[PDB]
Design a binder for this molecule. Sequence first.
Ligand code: HEM
Length: 153
Amino acid sequence: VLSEGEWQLVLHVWAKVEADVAGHGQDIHIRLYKSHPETLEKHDRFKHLKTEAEMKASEDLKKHGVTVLTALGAILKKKGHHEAELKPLAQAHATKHKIPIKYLEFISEAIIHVLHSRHPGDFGADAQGAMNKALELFRKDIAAKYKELGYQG
Ligand code: HEM
């Protein structure tokens, strides 16, 4: 469980994300695919994007990153009370897309990296720790929902 202080730090940096959701989402996806190339194979519509500039230029990828961060931000704002928001997400990623928990660790690393790169004055040690705890809780709870659906990834 996170303390109220830790949730406030999470939501404080998230308000910064919200000034440019698209760009944060592009940088996160580009970092993810570059750091952990096995992840990009899950997206057939993104495979022809070979360079960073091609990735940034893709409206499809840009919209997808907003879809992703919108869902995540709605989850974070519930401060752990997120079952109703996690179920549809788990259902899609366990039954349709088949995304192992390890890939959710990889995108968590990419989120932390990009938040630090863009907002270092608002993402110091305690804020990084708070966001780490929140993403860990997200991953723990989505893993339990995965197993309820019969997926052990
Ligand atoms: C913070 C973590 C993540 C969040 C919040 C998130 C959210 C979403 C949302 C809201 C959708 C749209 C509804 C749907 O079609 O299911 C989606 C689609 C998708 N997700 Fe994720 N997701 C995350 C991580 C990942 C990761 C790590 C991968 C794979 C490496 C992945 C692969 C996909 C794929 C393949 C789709 C379908 C895209 C399409 O329709 O073309 N996601 N995600």
